[PDB]
Design a protein around this ligand. Structure first.
Ligand SMILES: *[C@@H]1O[C@H](CO)[C@@H](O[C@@H]2O[C@H](CO)[C@@H](O[C@@H]3O[C@H](CO)[C@@H](O)[C@H](O)[C@@H]3O)[C@H](O)[C@H]2NC(C)=O)[C@H](O)[C@H]1NC(C)=O
Ligand SMILES: *[C@@H]1O[C@H](CO)[C@@H](O[C@@H]2O[C@H](CO)[C@@H](O[C@@H]3O[C@H](CO)[C@@H](O)[C@H](O)[C@@H]3O)[C@H](O)[C@H]2NC(C)=O)[C@H](O)[C@H]1NC(C)=O
Ligand SMILES: *[C@@H]1O[C@H](CO)[C@@H](O[C@@H]2O[C@H](CO)[C@@H](O[C@@H]3O[C@H](CO)[C@@H](O)[C@H](O)[C@@H]3O)[C@H](O)[C@H]2NC(C)=O)[C@H](O)[C@H]1NC(C)=O
Ligand SMILES: *[C@@H]1O[C@H](CO)[C@@H](O[C@@H]2O[C@H](CO)[C@@H](O[C@@H]3O[C@H](CO)[C@@H](O)[C@H](O)[C@@H]3O)[C@H](O)[C@H]2NC(C)=O)[C@H](O)[C@H]1NC(C)=O
Ligand SMILES: *[C@@H]1O[C@H](CO)[C@@H](O[C@@H]2O[C@H](CO)[C@@H](O[C@@H]3O[C@H](CO)[C@@H](O)[C@H](O)[C@@H]3O)[C@H](O)[C@H]2NC(C)=O)[C@H](O)[C@H]1NC(C)=O
Ligand SMILES: *[C@@H]1O[C@H](CO)[C@@H](O[C@@H]2O[C@H](CO)[C@@H](O[C@@H]3O[C@H](CO)[C@@H](O)[C@H](O)[C@@H]3O)[C@H](O)[C@H]2NC(C)=O)[C@H](O)[C@H]1NC(C)=O
Ligand SMILES: *[C@@H]1O[C@H](CO)[C@@H](O[C@@H]2O[C@H](CO)[C@@H](O)[C@H](O)[C@H]2NC(C)=O)[C@H](O)[C@H]1NC(C)=O
Ligand SMILES: *[C@@H]1O[C@H](CO)[C@@H](O[C@@H]2O[C@H](CO)[C@@H](O)[C@H](O)[C@H]2NC(C)=O)[C@H](O)[C@H]1NC(C)=O
Ligand SMILES: *[C@@H]1O[C@H](CO)[C@@H](O[C@@H]2O[C@H](CO)[C@@H](O)[C@H](O)[C@H]2NC(C)=O)[C@H](O)[C@H]1NC(C)=O
Ligand SMILES: *[C@@H]1O[C@H](CO)[C@@H](O[C@@H]2O[C@H](CO)[C@@H](O)[C@H](O)[C@H]2NC(C)=O)[C@H](O)[C@H]1NC(C)=O
Ligand SMILES: *[C@@H]1O[C@H](CO)[C@@H](O)[C@H](O)[C@H]1NC(C)=O
Ligand SMILES: *[C@@H]1O[C@H](CO)[C@@H](O)[C@H](O)[C@H]1NC(C)=O
Ligand SMILES: *[C@@H]1O[C@H](CO)[C@@H](O)[C@H](O)[C@H]1NC(C)=O
Ligand SMILES: *[C@@H]1O[C@H](CO)[C@@H](O)[C@H](O)[C@H]1NC(C)=O
Lengths: 559, 48, 48, 49, 49
């Protein structure tokens, strides 16, 4: 129904309160009674950097969603009744609108064209226009200071979880402290990409125009962070107390013991204080794609009995370019390495084999299987590491001249070629000519009869084999480096070697053809930078032992 | 003294064994396998 | 479990486009499904 | 001797084995062999597992 | 409390359950609870226990 205008633009004001010990919710449906469980996840840390906004005073900034947003409102009247979820806040991408009008709840997911300052409208103490959006495109989903309301919004696996809590307080200014718990209400399923969150609030006027912010309300925003906490459940199952195991040295000791009271003495603690945040990615800098066309668009493939090998080196492997081509693989299996993480590795020795087999013989190109191809034509080792690709070529390979070996005394070894033409005799007696007791070892694929079945159609098979983390690499995935960070325990990635620890300098001398530094306990300690060609050092972020002395829970809390 | 030192050294050096997994190192297992497949590899190391 | 119903132009270098042409391509592509005598792999399928 | 089946003009579209490995099928001694044969639809081959 | 269908325990052993037809809670207790001991005078001696 259109939208109003606000030419006046007062600069927003930012203040920093704290969240005390609030922002807890039921993270699961498992009913726990009279026990303590330690759970990790995305919660609100105690004493956080909560931010306050007021309502010409009209602040509706675009708050990044992150991993979750904690929303709490303190008001004397219903002025805040909705939020806006979206990524770009335009009609190009879909967005979600949740408002309160009638029976249950008004929630809409659509392509909106929001105005500059979305807001509601209440005139003469009654309902009025709904100046939030002005157009609804092709869309699917539809469903229909004494007050303190707290809401927690989380979006995982396409599900938007909503938590609600109500409390009565009497405070003129400042977020009240205490302990709060939230209970889930909504589990609305909607697949979106939420990056920003906005808020919509009502404005009041006299009759029809000159809207002014007569009533002011206070709302707070909090950012969820990955923290580890310990929880306590009563007989009813309600949460009564919790400890964030990162605040003070007493916290991690209490969490380790899994209790809520301590005795006088000295105890040993674990590491719950330092977490890496920076990443150091390093790859050797080269830029050239593999000859995918030379292997996937080669105009001539030989027979299976005369398969050929090709060597690949000095690449920047990128399987995504194969999508643009007009090739449709009917079989794609990988052994040893997961297909999902094929773009974050560095291959050391890549080889490719290509040939032509029948449609029903594609299954026999797997390790540990049997068949005439697996026995006399092409066999794979039991410890094969790589991927297998195959596709149909009925429109290029509908010719004659393809053969396979049918008769052979012994079984071929893996990765063996047996291009031979001599006559075969079942009794082993040498032959002199083709005829009785002498037969041609090779046989024809036909491939020329009209209207053949799918199993008798020609197919093109390519086998890729590579080795990992044994020798210096030449083919790596499409990744970019992020320089080098020193004197910090961080998460590094050197040619596909994830780790964690501090790196300052190294003076160790070693031999060439080395990429990693091993140890008697198989723990990495040194590594060679492929970009600066110098050795580094790895040391865990936590080395020493820490002990905490306490006088007892009743006695005091100083440690 | 020698018994205590030998026990500590053996406990330290016992980590080289990979038991029934594919590698003693844990970084490479998570660098090439999905978590659904890596859990089986991690379980035997944890038990050992 | 994500839906990405979009139609905006795509550029490999990330530079915003103004019209379809050089360095700007249509994100969506056709299934054909109309050519006579197509193979089994190119036939339409219904997935639930 | 499963190798004699290669000379014939039969092309199996499904060959799975349970319990025993196909590789070592020629180095065993079977005690009680029985065979069942029938006709099913093309999409019902998977339901014989 | 409502929205409950099963009764858990500290040892993850079921002890209570809600009947979906009569809407009332029940109880579960194993068929064997106590311990049993048998006194015998020996095989040669007799068979009474
Ligand atoms: C679960 O939470 C309740 C919250 O009230 C805990 O308090 C108990 O609540 C019940 C039900 O309201 C009370 O029963 C009532 O008590 C008085 C005296 O008889 C009277 O108002 C009613 O006739 C009724 O019986 C109960 O007294 C109260 N207990 C206490 C200690 O305050 C309840 O304990 C929690 N349940 C568990 C299993 O932890
Ligand atoms: C990519 O790897 C190549 C090797 O394959 C590396 O080449 C090196 O490039 C650096 C760029 O900083 C050169 O260092 C420069 O050398 C002179 C020293 O007088 C001067 O121009 C700069 O102060 C700087 O130190 C280095 O000489 C060169 N190595 C050679 C030519 O053998 C390179 O590190 C990688 N490319 C990057 C990081 O852009
Ligand atoms: C997906 O595949 C298509 C079809 O192969 C690719 O189109 C081709 O793109 C290349 C450049 O990547 C074009 O080559 C260039 O064309 C002109 C000729 O005047 C000129 O700019 C250069 O001298 C160079 O030769 C090629 O013509 C073009 N082929 C077509 C349009 O049939 C496309 O780039 C691939 N990638 C996508 C769409 O992201
Ligand atoms: C590599 O080539 C050698 C040499 O031809 C192959 O060894 C040969 O294997 C065949 C089949 O097992 C042997 O034939 C047998 O010989 C005697 C009678 O001569 C008898 O045991 C059987 O009736 C059968 O005919 C042949 O003697 C043997 N030759 C030698 C010199 O050892 C070998 O199999 C080939 N490797 C592979 C992997 O195929
Ligand atoms: C692969 O299969 C072919 C086709 O069935 C086999 O050829 C057949 O071989 C048998 C003997 O194993 C032949 O029978 C014999 O033929 C003549 C008839 O004058 C004679 O020697 C015997 O009385 C006996 O009947 C049969 O004729 C022949 N069929 C043909 C050629 O169509 C072949 O032996 C099999 N094995 C290979 C090629 O290793
Ligand atoms: C199926 O589930 C329904 C609920 O979805 C249950 O409905 C209940 O049906 C029973 C049948 O015995 C009703 O009990 C009867 O109520 C009055 C009491 O004065 C009397 O007719 C009988 O003595 C008997 O107790 C019960 O009221 C009813 N619940 C309602 C209407 O809310 C039902 O248990 C299930 N249907 C069966 C078991 O056939
Ligand atoms: C959160 O902020 C409140 C409000 O400022 C803090 O409460 C104050 O704590 C100091 C501690 O020296 C007391 O002197 C004040 O009287 C308290 N003020 C109020 C209004 O309660 C609270 O300590 C903070 N919590 C933290 C930092 O964990
Ligand atoms: C909020 O506004 C909507 C949209 O104008 C109204 O929609 C009506 O909802 C009631 C039930 O509350 C239905 O009986 C009417 O049929 C709806 N109107 C139309 C035109 O479809 C509604 O009054 C308000 N509340 C809700 C929950 O939608
Ligand atoms: C967006 O909604 C519109 C309107 O329903 C759809 O656009 C129509 O698509 C059909 C496809 O056959 C065309 O023939 C019409 O000309 C289109 N109409 C307009 C007004 O553009 C469109 O398909 C929807 N987009 C989706 C579902 O992604
Ligand atoms: C390799 O790429 C060439 C083009 O460089 C493809 O050749 C086209 O194939 C289609 C489909 O059969 C024909 O309609 C076209 O006339 C061919 N030429 C051109 C210029 O498009 C070829 O199919 C690809 N694949 C191979 C040879 O396996
Ligand atoms: C967070 O609050 C603290 C005081 O609790 C303040 O020093 C700091 O500047 C605030 N902001 C950030 C980003 O840490
Ligand atoms: C989408 O928004 C743009 C930018 O304002 C506008 O030009 C365009 O007409 C809008 N499209 C529709 C279908 O409303
Ligand atoms: C701690 O102090 C309270 C105070 O009354 C006392 O009753 C309680 O027994 C004490 N707890 C322990 C564990 O000693
Ligand atoms: C039980 O009695 C027989 C009777 O001759 C005796 O020989 C035997 O040793 C006895 N067995 C045992 C286990 O004492």
């Amino acid at each position: 129904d259109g939208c109003g205008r606000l030419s006046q633009k007062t600069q927003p004001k930012l203040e920093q309160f704290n969240s005390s010990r609030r922002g807890l919710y039921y993270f699961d449906d498992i009913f726990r009674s009279s026990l303590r469980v330690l759970t990790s996840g995305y919660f609100l840390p105690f004493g956080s950097n909560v931010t306050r906004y007021e309502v010409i005073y009209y602040d509706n900034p675009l708050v990044p969603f992150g991993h979750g947003v904690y929303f709490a409102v303190t008001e004397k009247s219903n002025v805040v009744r909705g939020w806006i979820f979206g990524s770009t806040m335009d009609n190009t991408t879909q967005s979600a609108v949740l408002v309160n009008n009638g029976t249950h709840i008004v929630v809409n997911v659509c392509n909106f064209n929001f105005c500059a300052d979305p807001m509601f409208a209440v005139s003469a103490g009654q309902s009025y226009k709904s100046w939030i959006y002005t157009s609804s495109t092709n869309c699917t989903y539809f469903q229909a200071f004494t007050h303190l309301r707290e809401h927690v919004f989380r979006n995982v696996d396409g599900f938007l979880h909503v938590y609600h809590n109500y409390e009565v307080i009497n405070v003129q200014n400042g977020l009240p402290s205490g302990f709060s718990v939230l209970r889930p209400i909504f589990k609305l399923p909607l697949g979106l990409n939420i990056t920003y969150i906005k808020a919509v609030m009502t404005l009041f006027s006299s009759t029809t125009s000159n809207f002014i912010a007569a009533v002011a309300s206070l709302h707070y925003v909090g950012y969820l962070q990955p923290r580890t906490m310990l929880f306590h459940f009563d007989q009813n199952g309600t949460i009564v107390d919790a400890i964030d195991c990162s605040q003070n040295p007493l916290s991690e000791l209490k969490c380790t013991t899994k209790s809520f009271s301590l005795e006088k003495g000295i105890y040993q603690t674990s590491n719950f204080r330092v977490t890496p945040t920076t990443e150091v990615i390093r790859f050797p800098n080269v830029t050239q794609l593999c000859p995918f066309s030379d292997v996937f668009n080669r105009t001539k493939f030989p027979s299976v009995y005369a398969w050929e090998r090709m060597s690949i080196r000095d690449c920047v492997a990128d399987y995504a370019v194969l999508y643009n081509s007009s090739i449709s693989f009917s079989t794609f299996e990988c052994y040893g390495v997961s297909p999902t993480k094929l773009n974050d590795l560095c291959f050391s020795s890549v080889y490719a084999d290509y040939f032509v087999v029948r449609g029903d013989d594609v299954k026999q190109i797997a390790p540990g299987k049997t068949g005439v191809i697996a026995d006399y034509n092409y066999k794979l080792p039991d410890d094969f590491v790589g991927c297998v690709l195959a596709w149909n070529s009925r429109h290029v390979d509908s010719k004659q001249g393809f053969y396979y070996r049918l008769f052979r005394h012994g079984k071929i070894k893996p990765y063996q070629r047996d291009m031979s033409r001599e006559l075969y005799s079942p009794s082993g007696t040498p032959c002199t000519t083709e005829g009785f007791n002498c037969y041609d070892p090779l046989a024809h694929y036909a491939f020329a009869s009209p209207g053949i079945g799918t199993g008798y159609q020609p197919f093109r098979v390519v086998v890729l084999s590579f080795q990992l983390l044994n020798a210096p690499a030449t083919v790596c995935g499409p990744k970019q480096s992020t320089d080098l960070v020193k004197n910090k325990c961080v998460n590094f990635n050197f040619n596909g070697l994830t780790g964690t620890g501090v790196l300052t300098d190294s003076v160790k001398k070693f031999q060439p053809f080395q990429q990693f530094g091993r140890d008697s306990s198989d723990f990495t300690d040194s590594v060679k930078d492929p970009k600066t060609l110098e050795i580094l050092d790895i040391t865990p972020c936590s080395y020493g032992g820490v002990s905490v002395i306490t006088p007892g829970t009743n006695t005091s809390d100083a440690v | 003294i020698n018994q205590n030192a030998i026990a500590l050294n053996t406990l330290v050096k016992q980590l080289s064994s990979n038991f029934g997994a594919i590698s003693s190192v844990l970084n490479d297992i998570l660098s090439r396998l999905d978590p659904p497949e890596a859990e089986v590899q991690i379980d035997r190391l944890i038990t050992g």
